[PDB]
Ligand binder design. Structure first.
Ligand SMILES: OCC#Cc1ccc(O[C@H]2O[C@H](CO)[C@@H](O)[C@H](O)[C@@H]2O)cc1
Ligand SMILES: OCC#Cc1ccc(O[C@H]2O[C@H](CO)[C@@H](O)[C@H](O)[C@@H]2O)cc1
Ligand code: NI
Ligand code: NI
Lengths: 158, 158
């Protein structure tokens, strides 16, 4: 089991850490949502699916920088929604193919009501998402840690 | 099969990730190349050359930060040249000795016409190069992920 990012990098068997740079809507008004869809960015696969089932959770999601201070939101993982920053590990999603498949994580973020002007700075860390991978085969229990960065400023107009 | 960097770190049998810092020409004009030769830094060896042949490709090369935004380039891998960021996995290089041999990868980067001022920041991630290793012996298929960082600022004069 290993993962890769779009036009990007890989975190190999055994886990590790990587940076993911995402383009964000440049303007988001109070009452609109900023959507950070990692399912187009992070892809994973099972290396021996004919005998091994891989189990993958979002063990934890935390907010940083402008997202931490100026937005509130939720995280959607494989079709269910949870608080973000997270309060517990999600249910497992099964990976059972050698073909790269999306990690089905998306953040749905909305400006706090007093936010105005530059709410997220270009180049800044906005989130850390920990993918936890286990299996039905051995004692493997690995973390794949994704540091998520904004490529551009996001402005909340006034 | 494992790899190390000169005065540096190691990625052991089975693959993994490591960080590599490179010195860059401090001033580079439109129409000139920054040459980043990793073959003097990254070295690999075969752990059982008497019965095993190791096959090593450049699986993917990706650009980040100032290189992604301010440069275009190519990669030379074992005597052939390709676009960088890459568009496919290269042909293989054979490793058949216990003696350290260079991984023969070099990047040639040239500023785009909008580059001006500090086009690459000191300390910043500039590229990821993924070495994929297999053999003629078993099912081993491992990735060695090299994160390339700039040691110094590179300026594009205006
Ligand atoms: O002889 C035939 C074979 C084989 C094979 C054995 C283990 C293995 O582990 C990785 O791939 C597994 C499956 O994706 C993971 O569950 C492990 O955590 C680990 O990443 C992958 C392939
Ligand atoms: O009885 C003596 C023996 C033996 C032996 C079997 C496998 C092996 O794998 C490593 O070294 C091999 C050769 O470098 C690699 O192809 C593998 O992927 C792995 O890194 C090394 C030695
Ligand atoms: Ni694989
Ligand atoms: Ni060795």
């Amino acid at each position: 089991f290993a993962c890769k990012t779009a036009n990007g990098t890989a975190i190999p068997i055994g886990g590790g850490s990587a940076n993911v740079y995402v383009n964000l809507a440049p303007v988001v008004n109070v009452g609109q949502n900023l959507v950070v869809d990692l399912s187009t960015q992070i892809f994973c696969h099972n290396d021996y699916p004919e005998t091994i089932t891989d189990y993958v959770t979002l063990q934890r999601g935390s907010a940083y920088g402008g997202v931490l201070s100026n937005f509130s939101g939720t995280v959607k993982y494989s079709g269910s929604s949870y608080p973000f920053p997270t309060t517990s590990e999600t249910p497992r999603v099964v990976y059972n193919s050698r073909t790269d498949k999306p990690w089905p994580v998306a953040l749905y973020l909305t400006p706090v009501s007093s936010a105005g002007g530059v709410a997220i700075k270009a180049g800044s860390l906005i989130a850390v998402l920990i993918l936890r991978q286990t299996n039905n085969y051995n004692s493997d229990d690995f973390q794949f840690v994704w540091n998520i960065y904004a490529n551009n400023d996001v402005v909340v107009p006034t």
